[PDB]
Amino acid sequence: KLYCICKTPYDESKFYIGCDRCQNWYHGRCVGILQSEAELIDEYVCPQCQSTEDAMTVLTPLTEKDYEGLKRVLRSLQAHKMAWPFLEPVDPNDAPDYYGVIKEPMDLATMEERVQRRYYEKLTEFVADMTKIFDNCRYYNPSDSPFYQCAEVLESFFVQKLK
């Protein structure tokens, strides 16, 4: 029976904190929780359990309520002052080779269509589409391009809105 992150036999003399979920025990030192602090918590959830929980959270089927959130985030990007180049599909007149270089184009108008028809089933998929907009930009344009830089800024804004 190996307990804790350190995977060691139980030592009757050491201080441990239990995780109800997985029923494992952790040396307060291994998870960095002082005994005084341990008393301040009612239901401790170990790191592994918390990680798995979050991983499962972002993959959970989206609910109508969840969509209120996706709509908000999408609208915030569309309203961003520097988001004008991604509101609609790239126009060849501005970049003749674009659609030959970018195999999976994406834009905010298309994401809006997909949001409306509830095309996304998990938060991960919605995030994938948005990331695609930024990745395509950084891929097509050189790093010293204002557009490449804009993609950088907008993605950080996106990550913040998601938090």
Interacting residues toward a second copy by CB under 8 A: 12-16, 27-29, 34-35
78 contacts 108 by C-beta, under 8 angstroms: yes
* Amino acid making up residue 37: E
Residue 62 found at the interface with Zn ion (CB under 5 A): no
Looking at 30, 73, 102, 162, which residue binds Zn ion (CB under 5 A)? 30
State the minimum distance, in angstroms, from the CB of residue 55 to Zn ion. 14
Residue 46 found at the interface with Zn ion (CB under 5 A): yes
Query: How far is residue 85's CA from residue 115's CA, in Å, rounded to a whole number?
Result: 20
DSSP annotation of 21 reads T
Query: How far is residue 136's CA from residue 106's CA, in Å, rounded to a whole number?
Result: 8
State the minimum distance, in angstroms, from the CB of residue 19 to a second copy. 15
Residue 153 found at the interface with Zn ion (CB under 5 A): no
Q: Which string of DSSP letters, residue by residue, matches 96-113?
A: TTHHHH-SS---HHHHHH
**22 interface partner picked from a second copy, Zn ion, none, CB below 5 to 8 A per type:** Zn ion
Site residues (vs Zn ion, CB under 5 A): 4, 6, 19, 21-22, 27, 30, 46, 49
